[PDB]
Amino acid sequence: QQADSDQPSKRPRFDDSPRGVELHPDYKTWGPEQVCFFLRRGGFGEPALLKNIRENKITGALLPCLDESHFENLGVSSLGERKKLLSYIQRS
C-alpha cells in the first residue's frame, strides 16, 4: 500500500517557516568548517567572526594556540564572550 520508507504530507517553505544533528567529532585534522561547527555549538557565530575563518587561519591543529585578541583581528567584538570562548576551546 505504501513502502513506508516514503514520505511526508507536504513540504516546508521559506515564507511559512520562521523560528538533533550528530556530525563528526575528534579531533586535530579538522577543516575550518569543522571548527565553525564546533564554534556555533557554544553559542558563538557571529558571522562577523566566521565571515572569514574561510581562511586567514586555522587547522583542527591551530585551536589551542590561537590566543585571545588574535580574535580581535577576525571579528568577535566584545571582551566577555571573547573571555569564555577563550575558555570554550580547552577541556581536552
7 is an interface residue for another protein by CB under 8 A: yes
Closest distance to another protein from the beta carbon of 60 (Å): 10
Interaction pattern, residues 31-70, with another protein; x per rule: CB under 8 A = x-xx-xx--x----x-x--x--------------------
Closest distance to another protein from the beta carbon of 52 (Å): 13
Near another protein by CB under 8 A, which window of 23-31, 63-71, 72-80, 81-89?
A: 23-31
Contact 50, 83 (CB under 8 A): no
d(CA 22, CA 41): 11
Residue 44: name the closest of 73, 69, 71 by CA. Answer: 71
Contact 88, 23 (CB under 8 A): no
